[PDB]
Structures are given as structure tokens and as C-alpha cells.
């Protein structure tokens, strides 16, 4: 404000949540009384120091600071004010307005019933307003009145997420015509948020999750072609939190002006920098919409592309305990764990697959003097408690047709068993003849472990994998578990010697050597900018060392996937191989794998091709040792 005409220009301080700073122990609003007098502490009053002041708040304030100014307060809009706000939304088209004018009063009474019946303040005014906006949009689009399908989708998109609230029960107790009977999945509601069909813009998503498993589902199912740009709390050591917040806001800003999706795994670090973008309140210039993004005290209007969607993925418990009530009221809650997306026959395949895995593991052979019982976590590496819902959802997404047939059911079962067998150790495949599954199924599982699958070496797996025709895939992400040593650099030269006609000098990155995310990106961009078709990336972590390279894995995966999606051209194919080294002494069992999403899980026991032995232990298994020494 200094050095300017104070009759043609004013600067206004806007404090945005002064109700939160109210009974704070640091007492920041105690400063507020001498700053509204003359705008200076321990200084003389002057021009250009008295500034305008607006304080917006959602939590209450005491008027002992607001005797200094004018205080406006509202409790809650009552029922006629809700109907007036609904007509104020619908005022842009009067035909549709007095088409759907019959629904403004049952929706208002039903929303008041929801606001009484809910326990914690979860559903708010923007839910009701977005209900009116969705209903108005659909009745403009149809010009037919309103189907009960439209009303049940608008209610069920805008009032969901909370478990002990039956939304359709309340909103169709009032009006009895829209008793839509066939079920509406959370899948299709989330999909019609993420992919709309063309100021009528929906809110963004808050996908609430049990045990982080929703991003796996959204990557397996919804993300058609264009992967979003996952914006995440990088767990590389020696990263500064401040520069990561700055770079995350830079990536949100670029994705806003581009028109591509983001997925926010850390909203609580970014909410202060994004709260005006989530409010969906744009300013226009030439038909371009502009929203306020901030960093620290620096707020600027940034361009929002007309097709930009945002998903916040968050745990349900964290949303219910953390996540301030204004932030929940902007983000169109839906819940997505695994019992959501699995239809009940797929849950039967999950149960049958768990029994099959326990029968694969449990062998009855006391011909050797020992005593050890085999968990399926010892046998299938990466197996954990869930671990079969993941496998069944991978198999279903491999099928494609998805009508329950008994010819579909059989191949979902057999693909799920193939996915499990692809992470089994070969000694368990040898033990498999002493198992409850029978010698015939034991034989056919050994057949399609040594002839249909490729577990011999890492270079055999590459040679049968690079020759595959991966349809609609620019990048292929495979996680590999091993008990042999990691590749050293001579092994990379030998590996590139065998891959001369197929690959483009595979680059082996070792994950223990990267302090910062930037140096990891420096090597990933170094690999990506080199010319060639079918270039290969190998990222290596050993879990059994003094390095803590076990929580760098998700950061490395997300970082590589984001840089590949924003950096790869159109000609080249990209092959990423995360190699993880474990041990028989305990880490092969404690390991949690079958990370779904876009990562295919493979256990290759010995990464190196062996000159000594035959690469099929069945041929070693029918002979005895003396027959190994028979001459010509």
C-alpha cells in the first residue's frame, strides 16, 4: 500500500479461519487489537499502514475482539431459505426450474433430516447445493422431467461416504415416487465423477479407504489410458518438507493448466495451499477460469483447464478424526475398500482361492526327519492377509468380458491360480506332490510353472517378456522378488549382452544410493532421454541390510511412474523391473507383496542363468544322483 494514492487503492488483509486461532495457546489474535487501530506494533501511526480487514471463519469468535468491527453471523438456513437457495441456483433456466420445482421442498426437508440424524458434522450445505446443481443439469440435459434413476444418482453421489446414514432412505421417505430398486455401485458413481460427459462443474473426489487399497483399485479399473499424476508424500530421506510442498503445488499447478488428473495421498500437508481451488470458485478472463493457488503468503490465480479432476485418497478413520469439517464438505465422499468392487461371486473366488493356497502350502511328508508346517506366506512370496482379493481383482481385469457365465467364472479362478503360482518358490512346487491337491493337479501346476511361466532367470524372463504384445500399454511395471544376489554391474553388462536384439542397454538403479528424490529423478530422466525403442529400467532394493531401503520403494515406484507418464514419447516402450532381494531366514515370509494396481508380481529365485545345472528341476527330479554320472 505504500507509495500509492490511498483514495484509489487499498490493501485488505483477509484472515481465513480466525475461529481456529481463537483459544490457541500461542494467542495470535491478541495481536489483532492494536493492528486494527493503526496497523503497527510499537510504531507511530502513519498513512499506508491502516489496511482493510476481512476475517472469515466457520468456528465462532468472541465479540470482545469484534467490538472493533462489524460482525455478521448466521446459524443455519431454514427450510424456506433452502428452497430460496435452490431456486437461486435453478434461476438460469425457467423451464427446467418449474419442471423440478416440485423437488425443492422434499430435498430441503430430507437434508434437514440428514443434518439432524448425523452425529459428527459431516454432510453440509454444499452437498445440498450440489444435489440441486446435479438435478438441474440432468433435467436440462434430458428435457423429459426427472427419472428416478437421476434422482437416486444425484442423492447418492452427493450424500455418501458416511456409513451410519442411509441417504436414499431419508430422501425417498419424503417423496415416494423415486424408489429406484436396482442397485447403484460406488464404481459407477466414482466413474461418473472422474469422467464426465459434455458453471456446471462437480466437486472433486474424496475416496475413503480401508488400508490404502483404493489406489490399487483405481489403477486396475478406472484409469483408462491416461494415468493420473500421483502427488504424494515422498519418503526419501534427507528431503526437506518445505521444498516438497513447493514442488507438489508446482505439479498441481501444471496439471491444472494442462487438464490431467491428480491423486492426492497427502491432503493434510497441501490443504492450506489448495483450499481455494477445492472451493470451485473461479474468476474468468476470456473464457478461461482462474483459481487461487497459494504458497506461504503468495496467492496467485492459476489457469484451470476445463477437464481437470482431482481425487483425494484417504483413510476413513483419518477423515473421521482428522480432516476439518469445512474440508469434508467440499469433496464428494465415496467409500472404496475391496468389498465394494468385488461382486459376490468374486468373493466366493477369494474364499476358494484361500483354501486352494492353504492346500498348496500344507504338505504331508515326514519321510525326512524334520518338523515344519508351511504357511502359504512361506510358499507364495508376498502373500499376506488380503492378498487374494488383490489376485482375483487382477484376474477379473485380465478377463474383460465380465458377465457371469460359468465359462467366465472358471477362467477367473484359473487366472487367479496362475497369478498365485507366479510367486511360488520352486521348492514348494517340488513339495507340491505331497500336498492335498493331488498328484495330478500337482503335476499340472509344475507344468505351468516350468513351461508356461518363466522363473528360470531374470534374463529368461526378460526375453519372454519383451517379446510379448502388451496391448494399450506404453509402460509395463513388474515387481520381482529374488533370493539370489542383486545385479552388480558386471551382471548388467552380461544382461545387456543377451538383450542386444530386444532391449536398449538396461539401466540398473540401486535404491540405497539415493538420498533425495531429485537425484533419483536425475537418473530416471537420464534413462528416459536416451534414444532407443524398448528401453529397460531395473530398480533394486535389498531388504536384509542395514539400509532402510524398504520404505523408499513406494516413493521410487510413484516417482518412476510419474516421470514415465510425463516424459515418455510415443515411439518407445518402457519396461520397469523393481527387483527386491529377500532371504529364507525370515524376510521372505514377513514380506507383504501382491501390490496390485499396475504392478505384476513375479518371484524369480535365482536371477542369474546357470551354466552348471539344467533349468528344469523336474528333469533332475526323475533321475537319481548316480544317473547324473552316466557316460555316453
Amino acid at each position: 500500500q505504500q507509495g500509492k494514492d490511498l483514495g484509489q487503492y487499498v490493501s485488505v488483509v483477509v484472515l481465513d479461519e480466525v475461529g481456529l486461532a481463537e483459544d490457541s495457546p500461542k494467542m495470535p489474535l491478541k495481536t489483532l487489537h492494536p493492528l486494527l487501530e493503526d496497523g503497527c506494533i510499537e510504531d507511530d501511526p502513519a498513512p499506508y499502514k491502516k489496511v482493510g480487514f476481512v476475517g472469515i471463519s466457520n468456528w465462532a469468535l468472541d465479540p470482545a475482539k469484534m467490538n472493533r468491527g462489524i460482525f455478521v453471523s448466521r446459524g443455519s438456513p431454514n427450510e424456506k431459505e433452502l428452497i430460496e437457495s435452490a431456486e437461486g441456483i435453478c434461476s438460469s433456466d425457467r423451464l427446467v426450474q418449474d419442471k423440478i420445482r416440485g423437488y425443492f421442498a422434499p430435498f430441503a426437508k430430507a437434508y434437514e433430516t440428514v443434518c439432524q440424524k448425523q452425529d459428527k458434522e459431516f454432510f453440509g450445505l454444499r452437498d445440498y447445493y450440489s444435489l440441486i446443481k446435479m438435478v438441474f443439469a440432468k433435467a436440462k440435459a434430458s428435457k423429459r422431467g426427472l427419472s428416478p434413476q437421476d434422482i437416486t444418482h444425484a442423492v447418492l453421489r452427493n450424500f455418501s461416504g458416511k456409513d451410519n446414514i442411509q441417504a436414499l432412505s431419508i430422501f425417498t421417505a419424503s417423496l415416494p415416487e423415486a424408489r429406484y430398486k436396482e442397485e447403484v455401485s460406488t464404481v459407477e458413481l466414482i466413474k461418473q465423477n472422474i469422467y464426465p460427459g459434455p458453471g456446471a462443474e462437480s466437486r472433486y473426489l474424496l475416496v475413503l479407504t480401508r488400508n490404502y487399497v483404493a489406489l490399487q483399485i483405481l489403477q486396475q479399473t478406472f484409469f483408462e489410458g491416461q494415468q493420473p499424476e500421483i502427488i504424494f508424500g515422498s519418503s526419501f530421506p534427507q528431503d526437506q518438507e518445505y521444498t516438497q510442498i513447493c514442488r507438489n503445488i508446482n505439479r498441481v499447478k501444471i496439471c491444472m493448466e494442462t487438464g490431467k488428473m491428480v491423486v492426492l495421498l497427502n491432503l493434510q500437508n497441501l490443504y492450506e495451499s489448495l483450499y481455494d481451488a477445492l472451493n470451485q470458485y473461479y474468476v474468468y478472463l476470456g473464457g478461461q477460469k482462474y483459481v487461487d493457488l497459494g504458497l506461504g503468503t503468495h496467492r496467485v490465480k492459476c489457469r484451470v483447464h476445463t477437464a481437470f479432476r482431482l481425487i483425494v485418497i484417504e483413510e476413513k478413520d483419518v477423515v473421521y478424526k482428522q480432516f476439518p469439517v469445512p474440508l469434508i464438505n467440499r469433496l464428494e465422499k465415496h467409500y472404496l475398500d475391496m468389498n465394494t468392487v468385488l461382486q459376490p461371486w468374486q468373493k466366493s473366488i477369494v474364499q476358494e482361492l484361500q483354501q486352494w493356497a492353504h492346500e498348496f502350502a500344507d504338505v504331508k511328508a515326514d519321510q525326512f526327519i524334520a518338523r515344519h508346517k508351511y504357511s502359504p506366506a512361506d510358499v507364495f512370496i508376498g502373500y499376506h492377509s488380503d492378498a487374494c482379493a488383490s489376485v482375483v481383482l487382477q484376474a477379473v481385469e485380465r478377463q474383460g468380458c465380465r458377465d457371469l457365465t460359468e465359462e467366465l467364472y472358471r477362467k477367473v479362478s484359473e487366472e487367479a491360480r496362475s497369478i498365485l503360482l507366479d510367486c511360488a518358490t520352486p521348492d514348494a512346487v517340488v513339495r507340491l506332490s505331497g500336498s492335498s491337491l493331488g498328484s495330478f493337479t500337482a503335476k499340472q501346476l509344475s507344468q505351468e510353472y516350468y513351461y508356461a511361466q518363466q522363473h528360470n532367470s531374470f534374463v529368461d524372463f526378460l526375453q519372454a517378456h519383451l517379446r510379448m504384445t502388451h496391448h494399450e500399454c506404453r509402460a509395463v511395471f513388474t515387481e520381482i522378488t529374488t533370493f539370489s544376489r542383486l545385479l552388480t554391474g558386471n551382471d548388467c553388462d552380461v544382461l545387456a549382452s543377451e538383450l542386444r536384439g530386444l532391449a536398449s542397454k538396461p539401466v540398473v538403479l540401486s535404491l540405497q544410493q539415493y538420498d533425495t528424490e531429485y537425484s533419483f529423478l536425475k537418473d530416471v530422466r537420464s534413462w528416459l532421454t536416451n534414444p532407443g525403442k524398448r528401453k529397460v529400467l531395473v530398480i533394486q532394493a535389498d531388504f536384509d541390510d542395514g539400509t532402510r531401503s524398504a520404505q523408499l520403494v513406494a516413493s521410487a515406484k510413484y516417482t518412476a511412474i510419474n516421470e514415465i507418464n510425463k516424459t515418455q514419447g510415443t515411439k518407445d516402450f518402457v519396461f520397469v523391473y523393481f527387483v527386491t532381494k529377500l532371504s529364507r531366514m525370515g524376510s521372505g515370509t514377513s514380506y507383504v507383496g501382491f501390490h496390485g494396481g499396475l504392478w505384476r508380481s513375479v518371484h524369480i529365485d535365482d536371477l542369474r542363468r546357470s551354466t552348471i545345472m539344467a533349468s528344469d528341476v523336474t528333469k533332475l527330479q526323475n533321475v537319481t544322483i548316480s544317473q547324473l554320472f552316466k557316460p555316453e
Binding site: 416440485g102 428435457k143 422431467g145 415416487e177 518445505y242 508446482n250 476470456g286 473464457g287 478461461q288 503468495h298
Partner: protein, 619 residues
């Protein structure tokens, strides 16, 4: 074959067939369809498997609830083959299971109780909806429990159901028509609103459908005249004209608790009389143009909905609709085109007034002479048709385009003063990109101005001072082609037009003393020096008083603290990306050098607070 109770391979085969039946029941495929299984023991095991495994289990194997068992009977198609091959041969039920026959007994008890509430009308009406949407399966199970009339009973119950549904629909339309006027008046719905608020898990004989012929129902209407009021509101609730008449009649009445049967003659009959009066006016078309633009003001640019609305008016008086609708639709449409031609001619006279193009047009004189003329007839103005031939497809869109030339006189004054042709724009744009800011609004002003003047360059650069109508329209056609690839062109013209202060001071700008954040980042990345010292004063060892940045440039230098470099980093992360990667690598270099320096400050303060005496005086 079978080998008795002791043959263990037959016990394994029976356990495997039970697992195959359970697998074919977790999938919704049919187990038994054409199974010649003449050995009755193994056929009984198949039937016991399909009963026990296809049963609706939820949190417990038996179901102590009748309706889910009845939905199971109606929906699952192995139930009818089950009851058929159970009943047509009496030698099969004897060897099912104790438990399988318990579930069979529960199945026939549920079907007998529900379908025993069906000869009498005591059925809960949800189950009636169920059996009517599941007719063929219900008929087959009814035949198998009758062989151990129906179809006339189903048609009778069907027609009583349809009558109840349309009466509930009539009461719904009545409630919503009287609910559109809740802030005007209020009506007491007898006791119909509490009956209509009930769920339909109600028994069907509670809808009172008795005689002594006529179907009286639990929506007990005070008269059949209120019932036909509800029917004609339900047929006219989807007519916007009737909603206008309803609203103005409800406004004509003026804490007013009004009984229902006086609403019929207070509010429904005069509204219906005025509505039928307008209908019979539109029959022979003796309505005036004053009532046309007083009623149909919402129906401009929209003529499928007016087609449907006139069909809804025609369904009022039940006769034919052959030549009444389309002539009036076209006539109101032509009146709308005449009035949009009036507004278009007014704004086109405004644009030749503000643009300065005097010329002479000599073609839109009677069409403005008619705007002061007021005539009252419903006939086709024919001499204006040829006048409409020179304003055929301008639009009710695109007219803001001309109007945006009409209001921005100061903009076209400045553009004729300071641009003079198309080819100076490309230096001015390149001179404005320097003078605009760094953020995303400020940079896009240049592209707004560029796109706006290249869209309106067909008029504000090239129009001669004297023109006829012909070249004026023949270059407005090029204006509309230059519009159809950018619909936001009036927005760009108005947005640049309210940026004329900046657009004037583009070329009169002095050397601005301001460091853009990209230029300051390049200066720091090329000649800046970071300094760590742990200051020698009585200050603390916070990271804001340990790090400095020295920027040498007339040999002065500038000292940036840590928070000023953070402020620069924020401004630099949020600035508009110039789509070049030298800027990206300067921003990324500054970011990474600052991150590494801040990590060094962190380790330095840790060594200082640990108490080290080696890095006590380190710089």
C-alpha cells in the same frame, strides 16, 4: 455307479458333486436342465445339494424370514425344476435329506402363506409387485402346488394394482401442484398427505376396493370431482403455460389455512377456464401479438418443447391434432424471428454509429418503423419476410459479438489511433509480453488482446468509412467464421477493453525497476554466493540467521536472507510456465541448490548445538 455306504470313492464323488453344485450355485448357472439321472439315490443327492447350496444364506444358514424365501422361489430357475421333479414322481422326495426336506417344507409353507393371501386380497402389495414382475415362474409353481382359476385372478389383481398406482400418481401431482404454492398459500390435504406418506408394505384389502363396480381406495377423495381435478392436473403439470396460469391465479388470491374442496373453485376452475380460453383463442388464431409476447416469452429459441407443450394442451380437450399445432409453432417462431431482427437491427445501427462507418444502408428502415408500431392480430410483415432475408441467420447468439463492438468505443478509438493495421499487432504483442506480469492472469492478457483483435480484424481494421449493406454482411460472415473456432471472443474483447490502461502504457512504459523471479533466479544461479557463518553477534543459531545469499551486481551487492529466498521460491513455483525448458532448468537449479544449502545449514546447526568447537568458527 455306487457301492453303498462303505465305498469311499463314491463318497469322494458325492462330495465332489456337492462342490460342483455349490460352484454352479455361486455362479448363477442352471444345474438341473435335462438331467436323466434315473438312479434315484444320486439324483436325490443332487436335489439335496441344489436346495442346501442355492438357499439364500445371509449371516446364518436358515432363513426365518418369509419374503426372501419367496423372492428365492420366484427368481431362481432351479426351484421350478426342483418342485417338478419332486412332485411328478413321489419316489424322489423320500431320500433327499432331513435338512433338505426341512428347507423344502419351509419353501412350500412360504409359497402357501404368500400365495394363500392371493385368492383373498390380503397380499402385501410389494409381494404383488413381485409376482407380477415374475409371472411365468409363479404360474408354474402355482400349477405344481395346485396339481399337488388363477390367471383371471392375476388380471383382476393387476388391474386393481394399476388403479392404485394411478390414484397415487394423481394424488402425487395434486400434492406437488399445491406444493409449488407453499409460500403463497397453504392447503390442508384432509388426511390424504398422511396416507400418501405411508410405505407400500400395506395389505391390498386396506385399499378398500369394494362395491355395492367402483374402486374406492385409501386415498379417499372428498369427491370424484377432486379426482378428475387431480387427473387433469396430472395431465397438465408438464405444461409450462399451465404452470404460468396456475402461478398467476394463485397470486390473484391475495396465514391462509385453506381447505381442499374450495381450492377447486377458488384456484383450479378459473385457472382452467383461462387456460381453455387461451386454447380456444389459439384454435382459430384470433389471439393478439400482445398476448403472444406476454405469454410465450420463455419459449424463444426452443420449439420442440413448444411442440410438446401444445400437444399437452391438445390432450386437454380430447380431439385430433393434425393441422393446429405446426402452423402456430411456425407463426410464433416467425414472430420471434421478426423481433430478433428488430433487436439485431437496433444493435447493428448502434455498431455503425459507434464504429464510425456512416455509409448508407437504406434497408432496415421499415423494420425499425415497425418497432414503434403496435398491431393486434394473429395473421402473418410479409414484406418483412424479404427484410428477414437480409437478417436470416445472424442469431440470438453472435449478437453479443456485434454488441461488444457497440459498447467498446474507447477500445476501437485506441485501436484506430495506436495500431492502424494488422501488422503492428505482432510487435505490440511482443512488446506487451515484456510489460505484462509473470503470473497466469497477467500473461494471458496479451493472448486475450491478440485473439480479440484478430477475431475482430474483419471490422475494426478494414472497414471503409462508406459502405453499403452488401460488403458489411459479407465481412460479418467472415467475422462469424472467425467466431466459430473461439466462442469466447466477446469475452476476450471486453476483457482487453477493460485493460486499456495497461494497453496504453505498453509503449509509454519506462524502464521498470522490478526483478522478475525468473531473472532473479538466473542472477542467483549465475553470480550468487551462499554464505554460512554462525553470526558473531549476540544472535541465535536459527537457520534464518546462519545462511545468507550475496548477489553482486556500481559495485554494490544485495543480501538475501533465508525467508527472502523462500519467498522467491514460492513466487517461482507459482509463476506462469513460459513453455520453455531453459526457464525450467533455471528454476530447478535454484530449487536444488537452495535445498542442498538448507540441508547444510541444518547439519551445521546440529553440530553447533551438539557442541563441537570445530565447526564453531567454520564458514
Amino acid at each position: 455307479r455306487d457301492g453303498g455306504l462303505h465305498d469311499s470313492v463314491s463318497r469322494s464323488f458325492e462330495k465332489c458333486v456337492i462342490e460342483a453344485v455349490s460352484s454352479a450355485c455361486q455362479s448363477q448357472t442352471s444345474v438341473l436342465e435335462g438331467l436323466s439321472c434315473q438312479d434315484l439315490q444320486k439324483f436325490g443327492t443332487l436335489l439335496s445339494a441344489v436346495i442346501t447350496k442355492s438357499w439364500p444364506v445371509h449371516n446364518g444358514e436358515p432363513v426365518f424370514d418369509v419374503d426372501e424365501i419367496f423372492k428365492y422361489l420366484l427368481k431362481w430357475p432351479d426351484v421350478r425344476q426342483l418342485f417338478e421333479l419332486c412332485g411328478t414322481n413321489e419316489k424322489i422326495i423320500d431320500n433327499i435329506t432331513e435338512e433338505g426336506r426341512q428347507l423344502m417344507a419351509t419353501a412350500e409353507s412360504v409359497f402357501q402363506k404368500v400365495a394363500g393371501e392371493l385368492e383373498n386380497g390380503t397380499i402385501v402389495v410389494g409381494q404383488l409387485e413381485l409376482i407380477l414382475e415374475h409371472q411365468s415362474q409363479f404360474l408354474d409353481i402355482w400349477n405344481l402346488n395346485r396339481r399337488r382359476d388363477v390367471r383371471s385372478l392375476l388380471k383382476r389383481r393387476r388391474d386393481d394394482l394399476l388403479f392404485l398406482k394411478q390414484e397415487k400418481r394423481y394424488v402425487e401431482s395434486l400434492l406437488r401442484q399445491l406444493g409449488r404454492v407453499k409460500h403463497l398459500v397453504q392447503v390442508d390435504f384432509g388426511n390424504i398427505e398422511i396416507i400418501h406418506s405411508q410405505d407400500l408394505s400395506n395389505k391390498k384389502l386396506n385399499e378398500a376396493v369394494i362395491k355395492l363396480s367402483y374402486k374406492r381406495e385409501t386415498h379417499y377423495c372428498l369427491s370424484p370431482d377432486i379426482r378428475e381435478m387431480a387427473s387433469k392436473l396430472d395431465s397438465l403439470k408438464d405444461s409450462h403455460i399451465f404452470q404460468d396460469f396456475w402461478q398467476e391465479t394463485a397470486e390473484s388470491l391475495n396465514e391462509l389455512k385453506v381447505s381442499l374442496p374450495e381450492v377447486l373453485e377458488y384456484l383450479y376452475n378459473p385457472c382452467y377456464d383461462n387456460f381453455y380460453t387461451l386454447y380456444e383463442n389459439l384454435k382459430s388464431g384470433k389471439i393478439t401479438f400482445a398476448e403472444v409476447d406476454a405469454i410465450f416469452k420463455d419459449f424463444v429459441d426452443k420449439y420442440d418443447e413448444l411442440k410438446n407443450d401444445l400437444k399437452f394442451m391438445c390432450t386437454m380437450n380430447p380431439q385430433d391434432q393434425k393441422g393446429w399445432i405446426s402452423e402456430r409453432v411456425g407463426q410464433i417462431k416467425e414472430y420471434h424471428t421478426l423481433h430478433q431482427a428488430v433487436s439485431s437491427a437496433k444493435v447493428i445501427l448502434q455498431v455503425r454509429r459507434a464504429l464510425g462507418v456512416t455509409g448508407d444502408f437504406s434497408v432496415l428502415n421499415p423494420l425499425l418503423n415497425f418497432a414503434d408500431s403496435f398491431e393486434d392480430f394473429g395473421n402473418e410483415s410479409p414484406q418483412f419476410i424479404k427484410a428477414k432475408q437480409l437478417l436470416q441467420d445472424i442469431s440470438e447468439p453472435r449478437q453479443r459479438c456485434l454488441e461488444e463492438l457497440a459498447r467498446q468505443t474507447e477500445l476501437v478509438a485506441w485501436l484506430h489511433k495506436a495500431l492502424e493495421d494488422i501488422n503492428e499487432l505482432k510487435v505490440f504483442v511482443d512488446l506487451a509480453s515484456i510489460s505484462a506480469g509473470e503470473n497466469d492472469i497477467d500473461v494471458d492478457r496479451v493472448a486475450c488482446f491478440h485473439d480479440a483483435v484478430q477475431g475482430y480484424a474483419s471490422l475494426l481494421y478494414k472497414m471503409d468509412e462508406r459502405t453499403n449493406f452488401s460488403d458489411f454482411m459479407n465481412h460479418l460472415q467472415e467475422l462469424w467464421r472467425a467466431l466459430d473456432n473461439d466462442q469466447h471472443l466477446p469475452d476476450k474483447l471486453k476483457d482487453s477493453a477493460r485493460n486499456l490502461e495497461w494497453l496504453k502504457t505498453v509503449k509509454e512504459s519506462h524502464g521498470s525497476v522490478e526483478l522478475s523471479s525468473l531473472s532473479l533466479a538466473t542472477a542467483i544461479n549465475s553470480r550468487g554466493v551462499y554464505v554460512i557463518e554462525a553470526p558473531k553477534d549476540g544472535q541465535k543459531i536459527s537457520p534464518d540467521t546462519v545462511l545468507r545469499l550475496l548477489l553482486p551486481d556500481p559495485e554494490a551487492l544485495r543480501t538475501y536472507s533465508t525467508e527472502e529466498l523462500k519467498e522467491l521460491l514460492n513466487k517461482l513455483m507459482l509463476m506462469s510456465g513460459k513453455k520453455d525448458h531453459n526457464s525450467n532448468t533455471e528454476v530447478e537449479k535454484f530449487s536444488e541448490v537452495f535445498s542442498n544449502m538448507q540441508r547444510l545449514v541444518h547439519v551445521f546447526i546440529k553440530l553447533h548445538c551438539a557442541g563441537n568447537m570445530l565447526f564453531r568458527t567454520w564458514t
